Design a protein around this ligand. Structure first.
Ligand SMILES: *[C@@H]1O[C@H](CO)[C@@H](O[C@@H]2O[C@H](CO)[C@@H](O[C@@H]3O[C@H](CO[C@H]4O[C@H](CO)[C@@H](O)[C@H](O)[C@@H]4O)[C@@H](O)[C@H](O[C@H]4O[C@H](CO[C@@H]5O[C@H](CO)[C@@H](O)[C@H](O)[C@@H]5O)[C@@H](O)[C@H](O)[C@@H]4O)[C@@H]3O)[C@H](O)[C@H]2NC(C)=O)[C@H](O)[C@H]1NC(C)=O
Ligand SMILES: *[C@@H]1O[C@H](CO)[C@@H](O)[C@H](O)[C@H]1NC(C)=O
Ligand SMILES: *[C@@H]1O[C@H](CO)[C@@H](O)[C@H](O)[C@H]1NC(C)=O
Ligand SMILES: C[C@H](CS)C(=O)N1CCC[C@H]1C(=O)O
Ligand SMILES: [Zn+2]
Length: 598
């Protein structure tokens, strides 16, 4: 009978959760060892342990059928059982899972091992993306140099893994269907527990799209003045290599040439950080201080003892893309970051520490609940703090911004700078998953895979490659998350919801009042606010114990993902920018790109 079984089920779940945590700890250690030290031996070890855990997950999913869990009274017990039925890749046959693992590591290791030759010195061929190539992309204003590095990188990080990527799509699809999802798109979207989630994002994106068009138009205008009309056309998509980022996902690195008021201050604290003798250790210590200042949890000793916060100086290959790690014990949390002393890197430190804080806040939950309310929540935490860290208000407090006058023009410069990171990213993030969803769903024939990628980048972002690409090239895997099989919609969601969190945290901190000119949203600093911290504790401690609208409700009483907050933040910029574009007769929109030959 059901009453007695539900008691037994509760006991079954308690033990199983603890067992899953312990088994996952072993897989995580091997995955950490591989990411920190790419070798054939470490690859073998990572993939063999994963195969072993997958085998156990299969047994668990099979064992859930022995319980009448759908009949139970407790929503909590039913939710835990449901989490256990979802196998993901573990649903694949033993041999298929092993092949998928070998395929994934082949792609991630290819990306991590990419080396190019120096533009000026064809004998020096040991430039890696991080930091060598990225330094050039961000700093060089030589369009031919930029285009050289773009082509070299994309050819090696992208085209080189086409066949592996094809097999990955096949096995991802097979796995999804064994879980009775239509494709991997539906498997990923299941994490958001909302059958209208795609439409919700389309609607929010449509509301912000006109603002993006205005920013795009103004940036293109300013780039024409710098590079000339031979490099940048008035009516065409922007050549992406000019945007200060390898993937044109954020444009803040070219702020010095596109800033609204060039005679007024533009915040760039990198030089002051170096001047004051900042180190990676100091940057992480300052992030820790920000969290502890809000009455949130201090970084444990394991973090300091075990984290990797600088690129290793021996000859080893590693994954340098920044990552935060939960080892599912108590207080064993780690970051691996190839940290550099720059402003943007200071934001990245706070982003990664946001993941760490989430791990610490929910470590008391049963294993299945030790994850974000949805994947976007996990990405948003640290970015909320980064928004405060980026303010002139905060940067003056820590002595990184000196002799700053916050007049009307300086404010527009700062809002524009933020928008180059926050608004610009939205169409980029949407296209990363729109692309993969289309391949997962079988909507694009293999013969059209590369130009389907550039078509999307054109349609949504109005950017294009520096050189003509074709189906001989395969450019998508040149982005880390595509080579490493990391869902990207989490970042689009994050960039929307982080403004909901920021706005509410600021109101709570007494730092934002829409009717008080002295308290604008774009200069809010939540440092030292226990009130803002209280809201974070309330939400993060839930982990995934409840559907995400309940986690949002715990923070600020709202239950809906909304574009209201991000639009509110950038409203003063929108008004100024629309007028500035009219004043300067700026062309808005773009013709279809000619840079991908079918
Ligand atoms: C994805 O979707 C798949 C379907 O498209 C699904 O696969 C199905 O899972 C079913 C299990 O839930 C399974 O149903 C069983 O079928 C057995 C015989 O099927 C054979 O012949 C079929 C042709 O008709 C073939 O196509 C199959 O390949 C099989 O060879 C039955 O023998 C079996 O029955 C037993 O179990 C039921 C279930 O009992 C339930 O639980 C309690 C038990 O205490 C009951 O009180 C309760 O009422 C409830 O019914 C018993 O009632 C019964 O007495 C038997 O003991 C069972 O019906 C089905 O075969 C399978 N495939 C197909 C094609 O249908 C996947 O499971 C889905 N995957 C995921 C991850 O969700
Ligand atoms: C990297 O891994 C190899 C074996 O795969 C091991 O011998 C070596 O100690 C590791 N290197 C470092 C720097 O940890
Ligand atoms: C700090 O957090 C604790 C719980 O961690 C809470 O009980 C306490 O009220 C908070 N202190 C302040 C000043 O808000
Ligand atoms: C550094 C983090 C790791 S979770 C990251 O990958 N981000 C943060 C913003 C977007 C995305 C990217 O770099 O592509
Ligand atoms: Zn992240």
């Amino acid at each position: 009978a059901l009453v007695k079984e539900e008691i037994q089920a509760k006991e079954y779940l308690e033990n199983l959760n603890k067992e899953l945590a312990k088994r996952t700890n072993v897989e995580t250690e091997a995955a950490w060892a591989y990411g920190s030290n790419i070798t054939d031996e470490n690859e073998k070890k990572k993939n063999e342990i994963s195969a072993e855990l997958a085998k156990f997950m299969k047994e668990v999913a099979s064992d859930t059928t022995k319980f009448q869990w759908r009949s139970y009274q407790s929503e909590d017990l039913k939710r835990q059982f449901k989490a256990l039925t979802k196998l993901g890749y573990a649903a694949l046959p033993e041999d298929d899972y092993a092949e998928l693992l070998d395929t994934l590591s082949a792609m991630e290791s290819n990306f991590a091992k990419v080396k190019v030759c120096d533009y000026k010195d064809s004998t020096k061929c040991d430039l890696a993306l991080d930091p060598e190539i990225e330094e050039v992309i961000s700093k060089s204003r030589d369009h031919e140099e930029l285009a050289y590095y773009w082509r070299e990188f994309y050819d090696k990080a992208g085209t080189a893994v086409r066949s592996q990527f094809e097999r990955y799509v096949e096995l991802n699809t097979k796995a999804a269907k064994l879980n009775n999802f239509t494709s991997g798109a539906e498997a990923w979207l299941d994490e958001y527990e909302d059958d209208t989630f795609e439409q919700q994002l389309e609607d929010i994106f449509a509301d912000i799209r006109p603002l993006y068009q205005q920013i795009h138009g103004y940036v293109r205008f300013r780039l024409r003045k710098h590079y000339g009309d031979a490099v940048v056309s008035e009516t065409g998509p922007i050549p992406m290599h000019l945007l200060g980022n390898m993937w044109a996902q954020q444009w803040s690195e070219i702020a010095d040439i596109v800033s609204p008021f060039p005679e007024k201050p533009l915040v760039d604290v990198s030089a002051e950080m170096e001047k004051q003798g900042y180190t990676p250790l100091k940057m992480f210590q300052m992030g820790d201080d920000f969290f502890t200042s809000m009455n949130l949890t201090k970084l444990p000793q394991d973090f300091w003892d075990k984290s990797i916060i600088e690129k290793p100086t021996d000859g080893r290959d590693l994954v340098c893309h920044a990552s935060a790690w939960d080892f599912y014990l108590t207080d064993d949390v780690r970051i691996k970051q190839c940290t550099r002393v720059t402003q943007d890197q200071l934001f990245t430190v706070h982003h990664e520490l946001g993941h760490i804080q989430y791990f610490l806040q929910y470590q008391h939950q049963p294993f299945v609940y030790r994850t974000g309310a949805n994947p976007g929540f996990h990405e948003a935490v640290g970015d909320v703090l980064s928004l405060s860290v980026s303010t002139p208000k905060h940067l003056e407090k820590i002595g990184l911004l000196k002799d700053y006058v916050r007049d009307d023009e300086a404010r527009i410069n700062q809002l524009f700078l933020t928008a180059l990171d926050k608004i610009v990213f939205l169409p980029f993030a949407f296209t990363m998953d729109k692309y993969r969803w289309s391949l997962f769903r079988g909507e694009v024939d293999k013969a059209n895979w590369n130009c389907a990628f550039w078509k999307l980048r054109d349609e949504y972002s109005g950017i294009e490659p520096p050189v003509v690409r074709s189906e001989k090239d395969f450019d998508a895997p040149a982005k880390y998350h595509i080579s490493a099989d990391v869902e990207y919609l989490r970042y689009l969601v994050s960039f929307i919801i982080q403004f909901q969190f920021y706005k509410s945290a600021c109101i709570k901190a007494g730092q934002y009042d829409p009717d008080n000119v002295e308290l604008p949203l774009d200069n809010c600093d939540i440092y030292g606010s226990a009130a803002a911290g209280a809201a974070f504790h309330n939400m993060l401690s839930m982990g995934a114990s409840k559907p995400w609208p309940d986690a949002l409700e715990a923070f600020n009483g709202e239950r809906i993902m909304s574009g209201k907050a991000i639009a509110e933040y950038f409203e003063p910029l929108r008004v100024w920018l629309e007028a500035e574009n009219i004043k300067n007769n700026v062309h808005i929109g773009w013709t279809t790109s000619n840079k991908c030959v079918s």
